[PDB]
């Protein structure tokens with residue numbers, strides 16, 4: 277029956293929902309200053325010229341990458357640890373973990389802000405990879421992300437000390453398999469008693485179809501600029517859309533939960549270390 281945001285908060289408050297799975301994309305980090313693909317004006321769809329790209333996805337495609345790795349490595353240099361900080365959206369997910377409710381957070385983001393926010397790696401699936409590690413594209417030797425940092429920050433394409441191949445950060449490109457941890461979805465999605473979806477267009481698979489893998493009795497709460505993906509075309513009866521700014525949506529839920537002061541203290545402490 278037609279749920280509101282307040283109904284979902286009450287399910288949590290009454291402990292009817294104990295195992296929350298969360299799916300996020302780039303829209304949770306635009307408040308930190310990191311541009312997504314699809315927001316009007318600031319999205320990569322509107323800024324191709326600055327990255328020298330023919331279209332936004334080429335930055336994550338192998339043929340274009342081997343042809344010209346420079347645009348990807350400009351982004352790598354922007355997103356390497358240290359530059360951006362998590363915002364209130366991330367700290368809400370952190371608080372959700374601290375309050376014993378997070379079964380797992382599945383992210384398409386490569387900005388590593390989930391880990392920086394203090395969410396333990398065991399609770400995270402970085403489904404489209406990470407800059408924390410890198411692999412020679414030729415001989416497949418693995419490297420810590422640290423090993424190529426000087427070259428990334430100096431605009432030099434990192435090269436393998438064994439074979440001179442291009443050393444590529446472990447970001448999943450189109451056509452590539454997602455990491456092995458992604459298979460946690462097989463047991464995580466049937467176990468979930470609540471799905472939260474935040475800040476994504478749901479336009480990339482197999483990540484996007486995961487919204488379908490929860491039981492039909494499980495509410496799916498989207499907090500996003502617009503109604504998207506399998507939520508827009510296959511709506512279920514317990515789906516809830518909170519449309520608008522992601523942080524304003526999160527703030528309304530957090531206040532319904534009773535967590536506002538705790539969330540603000542958390543944000544104050546954490547962002548100030550960094």
Ligand SMILES: [Cl-]
Pocket residue numbers: 454455456457
């Ligand atoms: Cl893997």
Ligand SMILES: [Zn+2]
Pocket residue numbers: 412413414415416417436437438439440441
């Ligand atoms: Zn090599």
